[PDB]
Amino acid sequence: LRAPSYCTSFNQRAQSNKTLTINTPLTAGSQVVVALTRPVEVIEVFDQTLVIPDPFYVTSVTRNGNSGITLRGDDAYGAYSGLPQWAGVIMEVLAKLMTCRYAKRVRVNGSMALPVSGVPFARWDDGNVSVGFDGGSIIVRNASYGGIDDVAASVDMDLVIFNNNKPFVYDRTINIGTSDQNIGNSLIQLSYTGALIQNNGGYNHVRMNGIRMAGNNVRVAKNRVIGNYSRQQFQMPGKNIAVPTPLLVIPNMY
Amino acid sequence: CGWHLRDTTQVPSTMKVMILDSGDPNGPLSRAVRNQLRLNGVELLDKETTRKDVPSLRLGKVSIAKDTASVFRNGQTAEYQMIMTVNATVLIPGRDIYPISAKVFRSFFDNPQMALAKDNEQDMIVKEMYDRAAEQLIRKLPSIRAADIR
Amino acid sequence: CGWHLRDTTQVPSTMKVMILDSGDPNGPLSRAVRNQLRLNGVELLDKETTRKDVPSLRLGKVSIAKDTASVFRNGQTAEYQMIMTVNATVLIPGRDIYPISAKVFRSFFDNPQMALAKDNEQDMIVKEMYDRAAEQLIRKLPSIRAADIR
Amino acid sequence: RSGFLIPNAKYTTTNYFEFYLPYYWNIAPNMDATITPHYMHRRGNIMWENEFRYLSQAGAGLMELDYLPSDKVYEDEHPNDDSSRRWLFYWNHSGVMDQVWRFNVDYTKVSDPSYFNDFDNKYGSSTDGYATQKFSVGYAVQNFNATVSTKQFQVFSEQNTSSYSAEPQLDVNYYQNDVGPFDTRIYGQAVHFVNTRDDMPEATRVHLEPTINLPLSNNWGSINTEAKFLATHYQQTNLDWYNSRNTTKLDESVNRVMPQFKVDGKMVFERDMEMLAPGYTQTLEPRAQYLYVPYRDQSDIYNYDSSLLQSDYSGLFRDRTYGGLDRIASANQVTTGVTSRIYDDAAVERFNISVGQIYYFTESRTGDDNITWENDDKTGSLVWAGDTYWRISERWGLRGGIQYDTRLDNVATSNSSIEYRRDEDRLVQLNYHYASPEYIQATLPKYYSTAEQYKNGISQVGAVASRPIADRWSIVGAYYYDTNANKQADSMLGVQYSSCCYAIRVGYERKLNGWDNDKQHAVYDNAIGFNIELRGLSSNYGLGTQEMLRSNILPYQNTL
Amino acid sequence: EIWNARFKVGPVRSGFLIPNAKYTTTNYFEFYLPYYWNIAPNMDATITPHYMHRRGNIMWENEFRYLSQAGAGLMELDYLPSDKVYEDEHPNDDSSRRWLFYWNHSGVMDQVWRFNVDYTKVSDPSYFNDFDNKYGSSTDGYATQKFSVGYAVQNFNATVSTKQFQVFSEQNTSSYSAEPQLDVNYYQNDVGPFDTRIYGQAVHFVNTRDDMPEATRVHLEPTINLPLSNNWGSINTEAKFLATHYQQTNLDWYNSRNTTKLDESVNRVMPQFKVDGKMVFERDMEMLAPGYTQTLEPRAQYLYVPYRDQSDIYNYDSSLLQSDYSGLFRDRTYGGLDRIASANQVTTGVTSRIYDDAAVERFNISVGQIYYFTESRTGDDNITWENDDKTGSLVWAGDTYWRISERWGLRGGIQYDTRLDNVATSNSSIEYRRDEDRLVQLNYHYASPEYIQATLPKYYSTAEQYKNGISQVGAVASRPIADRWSIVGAYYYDTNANKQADSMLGVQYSSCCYAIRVGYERKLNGWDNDKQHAVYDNAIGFNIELRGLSSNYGLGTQEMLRSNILPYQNTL
C-alpha cells in the first residue's frame, strides 16, 4: 500500500504514429505508476473512399529515462495508421497528494456526469450491466442484450473520486481479462477496456467494452454503442479487443 | 512461311452500304456498332431512305449477367464474372436473313467501395464490353458471305 | 273409424313361392330371412326346381359401420351409433328386375372398463339388426308386385 | 405392375411437414402390397406403412404394420423411456370356405396407449378407450354350427389396468323344427375368463339353453307362446384377494337353473286415407307381451360379461335386460305397443309412429340389489318408449326416438335427425342426442356419476352442411354444441379446390382432447391442416366432399 | 455443423391465384395467398395477404400496376401492423409497425423526352435485413429516392437527375449522392476528316453525414478524332481536353484530423494524347488442315497525359480499375473524373486467329504488356506492392479460346506480373455441353496473395480469411436418366487448405402437371472469430412445383444448376 503523489494529467493526442510522449520531471528510481482512463479511442480511418471504424488501444508504457513516459499504441487490424487521444494520470511512488474528495453511494440511471473531476473508483453488484467511464460521465448499459440497440440500464454503485478526506492509497493492479478475476472487498477503477466489432443485424456493429463486476470478480463485457456501418458497403472481420493496460484496485477504506 | 497481308477480309464487298435498323437506335450498343462499322469503310445509309437492295444489320437484345465465380475462406464473393450475349440478324436483300451473335466474358474482383464510386466502375466495365461485342459482330460478317455464296 | 282387418297379406299372392338366392345361405342373414318367410306362409324353393316362373330374391351384401355419436366432456366417446345396409334384387320371371334396400339404425353406450361386456352386447345389437332389416325387405314385396303390375 | 403411386404432401400444425411416397408392390393376382414411406418433420424419422391385401380360399383381408423406429416428441414427453418406437397392427381376415366353414379375425395392437391420440389412422381415433384383439373360427350349416372365439382387449387407461378376456368361447347352436307343431333349438357356451392382473377372479362357465317355441298363425294375428330353460355351472377360483375386500364373498362351484315363460302377440288393421288425402292406406298394429322369470340370488358370481342394455321401442319386448349370461334379471311384466304406417298408392311405407310401455308387476331384481336409483320405485308404468320416421320426400327425412319415464319423471334418452340430401356433394343435416344425468348413474358405474366429466349427461345439438360452390370448390362445415355447459364440443370447417391436375385442401378442428384435473375444466385441441394432393393423369377426380365429412371426431352418417 | 431444411410448394380474371406455402427452420411456416383485382383496362391491383408465423401477424403486400396517360407504373405498400420479433430485437422503438413504399413511374413523351421515379421510403433501419422485400432498392443500406428527366436525339443528350437517401439516426455509413447532376453529350462527325464529341457534367455531392465535404463540379471533354483505315492495317490518333472546376465546402472536420489540407477552389486542366494502331496478316494453313487460314495481328498504342498534383481534391468518386487482356489498351486508370491519373506509356499486343473453311473462327491466343516510361503518379499514390521497380514492362497478360468441336470448348486468361515475380491470375475452364441437360465443366481460379494485398482494402492483408489468395478447382456435371428424371452436381475444392468450398446435389422428377425437387449443399458460411477456422452450413431443400396444364415443360436442369453459391455459366 503506497501513496504516490502526482505529476501530470495528460489528455492529448499522439505526436507520432501511435506514440505519446508526455514529459514530466522524475526522480531516480521513482517506479513510475501510470493510471490510464482513456485506453482506447475508436478512430475512423479512410481507405480509398471508405470510412472504416478502427479501435486504437495502448500496449506498452516505457519510461523515458528520468524525463517522462511514452505510450505505444496499436490499432485493431494492424494495417491502418492514426493518432489516438489517450488520457491518464501519471504518478511516482517516491508534489500534491491525491485525496478522497467525493465518496457517496449513488444510483446511475444510464449516464451520470462526475460531480467532481478526478479518477473514479467504483464497486457494484449486478450481472446484466456493465460500467465504463469515457472521459466525463459514468456510462451504464445493458450487457445481456444482444441486438444493435443502445439499451440503457440502472445500477447502484459506491462511488469514490480522487484528485488534487483520506489520502489516495492504491493496491494490487489487475489485468482485466475475459475470465473472472476475484478482487474481494475492493474497489475497481472505471475505464473502457477495449472495443468490439461484430456482424449483427446486418451492420458492422461497433461497441465499447467495460467492467462487469458480479459477486466480487470483474470481467470484460459489452457496453455503449458507437455506430453501425452497413455491411452492404464493406464487411469487416470480427474483433473483441481487450486492452492489456492494468486497472488500479484500492481497499474498501474510503 | 509467307504472310500475304490480307485480301479484303474486311466487311464483304457486298455489305459496303447497309442500314443499321435497331429497336433502340440511341442506346450505347447501337452507337458502339456504328463506330466499328464506320471504321470498316461501311457508310450507314440513312435509316430506310433508299428504296431497296442494300443489307441491314438488325441489332437484337443484349443480356448482361453478373454471377459469383470464387469465394474467400469465409464464404464471401471474391470474383464476379459478367457475360453479355448480343444477338443480331443480317438481312441480305431478297436472298434471306442470317443470324449472328456475340458472347463477351469479363472477370474481376469484388472491390468493396462506395456506391457512387462502385457505379462508375460497373459503368466503365459495361461500356468496354459493348465495344468488344460490337467488334465480334463485325467479324462473322465474312461468314455470311461464305454461307450465302453456297 | 271403419278400420277393418287387413285381408290382403304382406307377401303378394304372386310371390307365395320364392327362390332364395344368396352367396352364403348358412350365415346369419339367411337364417333370418328363412324364418321371416315361414312366418308368412311362404314355401321357399331351391335352385334345382324346374319351375322358371317362380320369383326369386337375391340377398346382396351387408355392411356394419359403427361410429361415435356423442362425446363426453373428457374427450372419449359416450354413445355409439351403428348402421347396417343390405341390398336385395328380386327377379320375377316374365318382367324386369327390381331392387330393394334396408337400413337399420341402433345405438348403445360405450364403457371402456367393461370391454368384454361391451362386446357381448355388440354381438347382440347386430344379431337383432339382422332381424329388423329382414322385415324391411319382406315389407317392400307389396311395392314390387304393385309397381310391376303397371 | 410394381410401381410407385401419386405422392401427397401436407403442412400440419402437429407435424409441420409430411410427405407420402406410396409404393405398390405386386405378386400373383390375389396378393399385393402398398409399402408407403411417410416422413414427419417434428417426429424425425420416417414412418413405414406396410399394407398387404390378399385373397385365398378362406377369404379376403388386409394387414398394416405402421412403424416409426424413433419419435422425437415421444422422447420429450417420456425421457425415462429407453426407446420411443411406435407401431400399429391391423389384421382383418374374414371369409367363408366351402360354403360351410367360416373364419374371422380382428386384431389391433399399439406400442403405447397414447398412440391414436397423437397419430391419425383409419383404424382408430382419439375418442377410444380400448383396441379389440379377437380371433374367431367355426363352421356353420342350416342346423348345426360351432365356433371358437378368443376375445381379448388392450384398454388404454392406466388408472384401472384390470381387463377381462375369454380364452375359448366355444358355442354350439343346434337348430331343428317341424317337430309336431313346435320348434326346437339348443345353445351352449364354455369359457375361461382370464384377467390381465394377478389378484382378480377367474371362471369357467357352461350353459345349456333349450327352447320349445310354439308358433301360431292367422291372417292378421300372431300369438307365440314360448318356454325355455337355463343352466349355468361355474368353477370360480382365485378369489383369495377379493374375499377380504367385498362383504358378500365369492364362492366356488355354483349352479344356476331357472325356466322362463313368454307370450307374444299382435294384429294388423287397415283404413283407407281417402277421407283427407286420397290414394293412401294406413294400418295399425297393436302388440302385447308378458314375461316371467324366477328370482335367483346372484350376488356370489362376479360380473364378467354382463352389461345393462338400452331401451328403444323394439327393446321393450326383449327377453333379458343384461346382454350376457352373468346377471339374468328377474321380473314379470307386460308390454304394449301400437304402430301406425301410412303407405302410398305404390304401397311404399312413407311414415310410421309407435309407442310402448313396460308396466311391471312386482319389481326387477337380480340378487345384486345395491344399485341406487335417483328415486326408487317398486311397480307401475315405469318406462315408456316411442319412435316415428317420416319420409317427407325423396330428398328429405325425419327420424326420432324417445324413452319417457315416470320412475324418475325425466326423459331417459331421446334423439332426432332431419336431413335434406340432393346429391352426394350437397346436404344439410341436424341431429340431437340427449341422455339425462339420472340415466348416467343408473347405467354406468359409480366412478362416472361422481366425476364432473361424466355427470351432467349428454345434450348435443349438431349441424352439418356442404355446398359445391361453382364446380371446383367443395366447402364443408360442421359445428356440434353442448347446451348443458354452453360450450362447443367439435367444430370442423374445410375447403377443397379440385382441378384436373392437383387438389389443395384446408382444415380446422376444435375437438375435446382431455380433462385437466387441477382446474377441472375441459382441454380443447385446435388443429390446422393444409394438404396438397397431386393427381394429374387420374381420370376420375371427385370433389372429396364425402371424405371431408368423415374426418372429425363425430363423423357424418346419412339419416336417409 | 449447422443443418437447416426448407420445404416449399407453390405455382411457378378478378379471382384468386395459386398460393405458395413454405417452411424453414428459422422463420417458420410462411404462407402467401395472392389475389388479382383487375378493375380497368389500365389499372390492376394485387392484394397479397402474407402470414409469417415467427412474427405472428399478417402483412399486406399490394400493387397498383397502372398504364394511364403518363406511362408505366407500379406501387407497393407492404404493411405489418405489429411485429413480435422486432419488439425483442429493438426495445427502444415503441411501436413495432413495419412498412415499405415503392414507386417506379416512367413514360416517354414524343419519343424524345423521358421520366423516371424510384421512391423507396421504408420504416426503420433494420427493415431490409429482416424481410426479403420483392420491390425496393437499397444503396449502402439506405433507401433511395432517385428522380430524373431526359432528352435524346441522334446526337444530343441531357439527363438532369437527383438522388437522395433516407438516412436514420442509427446508421453511420458514409455515402455520396448527386443532387442534381446535369449531363450533356454532343456527337457530330465528319467535320472534315475529323470527328468530334463533347461531354459535360454539373454535379453537387452531398454526404449523408454532416461532417464530410461537399463539392460542385463542372467538367468538359471536347475531343477530335482522325481515323485512317487501310485494307491490311489501321490507325487512329486523338487528342482531348479536360477541364474541371471545384468548390469545396464543409471542410472543417476533415482538415483538423489530417494534414493534406483540402483546398477551397481547384481548377484542373489536363490535355490528353493517344495514338492507336493495328496490323493484320494472313497465311493459308493447308499443311495442317485443308483450306484453313491463320491471321497474326500485332497491335500497339501510345498514351500521354501530364501530371497535375491532386492531393487537394477529395476523392468523391474514383475506384481503381482492375486488369484483363483488353484492359491494357485503356484510357483511364481510376474510374471517374475525380482522380485522373497521369501516364506516359506504350502498350503492345499480338493475336492469332485460326479460321476454318466456312470462315468461322476457331482459335485465338493473345499476349500483351505495358511499358511505362514514367511512373504513373496521381498525387495520392499509397498502394502497397512487392517491388521497387516502377518503369518498364511491368505487367503481362494472355488469352485463349479454342472451340474443339461444336460441343466442346476451352478458355484461358493469365496476368503474369514482374512487380512480384509470380502469376497473379490464371482463370481457366473447359466444358462439354451436348444440350440443355447433358453438360460437363471444369474450372480453375487463382489469385496470388500479393494481388490481394495490392488491390483490396488493407485489412485483407492481415486477416486469415483473405490473405492467402484463391486456388480453387471446380467441376459441374448433369445428365438425365429417364425421360422425366434429371441429375446435377457440383464440387468446388480449395487447394491452399484442402477444404471444400461448395458441394451440391439435386434430383428432379418433372411431369406435365407437377414436379418435385430435392437439394443438398455444404457451403462456407462465415469465420469462427474464436478458434480461427471456417464454418460450414449444410442445407437440404425440398420443392414441389405446381405446373398447370400448359406448355411449360423442362426437366429441371439449368434451374437447379444456379442454386449454389457458385452458379453455373455457359463458358462455351
Numbering used by the authors:
A (entry chain C): 22 to 115, 139 to 208, 232 to 321
B (entry chain B), C (entry chain E): 19 to 168
D (entry chain D): 225 to 784
E (entry chain A): 197 to 208, 225 to 784
What do the authors report?
Following its synthesis and transport from the inner membrane, LPS is inserted into the OM by LptDE, an OM protein complex essential for most Gram-negative bacteria. Several copies of LptA link LptBCFG to LptDE in the OM, forming a protein bridge spanning the periplasmic space that functions as an ATP hydrolysis-driven conveyor belt for LPS molecules. Once they arrive at the LptDE complex, the LPS molecules are inserted into the outer leaflet of the OM via a process for which the details are not clear, but which must involve a separation of the first (S1) and last (S26) β-strands of the LptD barrel at the front of the complex to allow the translocating LPS molecule to move laterally into the OM from the lumen of the LptDE complex.
Data processing gave two major particle classes, the largest of which corresponded to a monomer and the other to a side-by-side dimer. Besides the main particle class for the LptDE–RBPOeko complex, dataset 1 contains a smaller class of LptDE dimers for which we could generate maps to ~3.4 Å. No particle classes were observed for dimeric open or closed complexes. The LptD barrels are stacked front-to-front, with complex formation likely driven by an intermolecular disulfide bond between the Cys725 residues of both LptD protomers. Given that the N-terminal jellyroll domains would clash with each other this dimeric complex is clearly nonphysiological, but it allows a good appreciation of the differences between the open and closed states of the LptDE complex. Neither the open nor the closed state shows any density for LptM, presumably due to the lack of the jellyroll domain.
